[PDB]
C-alpha cells in the first residue's frame, strides 16, 4: 500500500470470535483511499477487483490487493448495513 | 464485468502449464460477441487488450484489464500453425 490502507482478520486470524471476513483497520492520511473519503476503518472488504475476499487467509487478501494494476476495484460493506454492497474504485 | 463473452487463464503465479506465464483464452459462450465475430479460438494465447501488454502479468492484472473495457475492444492474439503468428481481432460488447 500503495492505496495507504491496512486490513485485519482472516481465516485462522479472526478480528472478531467466530468472523472470518477481512477488515479495514488504519486509513492513511493523504493516501489514496483516504484522499476519496468512501472507505472508512471498519469497512468488511468482500472482494478486490474480481477476487472474492470471503474465507481467505490474511495473506491472500494482501497478495489480492497488491496484484491489481493502478486500477482498483473494491467492494465493501459498512458496518451493520443491508447487507448492501458498495463499489470504491480507486487509483495506486 | 464481462461480455464480450470468453474466458482466460494462466499468468504469472497461475501458470497453465509449468513454466508457461501466458494468459490462454479456455472458454468461449455460444452466441456471445466472440463467438459470433469467430476469429477467437479455445487454445488461443491473449498478448494484449487495448493498451495492456499481457505477457508476464498476474490473472488479476489480466481479467482487470479486460473488466476495464468500453463498447469496442482491440485483441490482440498469437496463433499457432502456418498463418501469420499475432492476430488482431476488434470486438463489440454485448
Excluded: C, R
Amino acid at each position: 500500500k500503495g492505496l495507504g490502507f491496512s486490513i485485519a482478520g482472516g481465516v485462522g486470524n479472526q478480528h472478531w470470535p467466530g468472523d472470518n471476513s477481512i477488515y479495514v483497520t488504519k486509513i492513511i492520511e493523504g493516501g489514496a483511499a483516504h484522499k476519496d473519503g468512501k472507505l472508512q476503518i471498519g469497512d468488511k472488504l468482500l472482494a478486490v477487483n474480481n477476487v472474492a475476499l470471503e474465507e481467505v487467509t490474511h495473506e491472500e487478501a494482501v497478495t489480492a490487493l497488491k496484484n491489481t494494476s493502478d486500477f482498483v476495484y473494491l467492494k465493501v460493506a459498512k458496518p451493520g448495513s443491508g447487507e448492501k454492497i458498495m463499489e470504491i474504485k480507486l487509483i495506486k
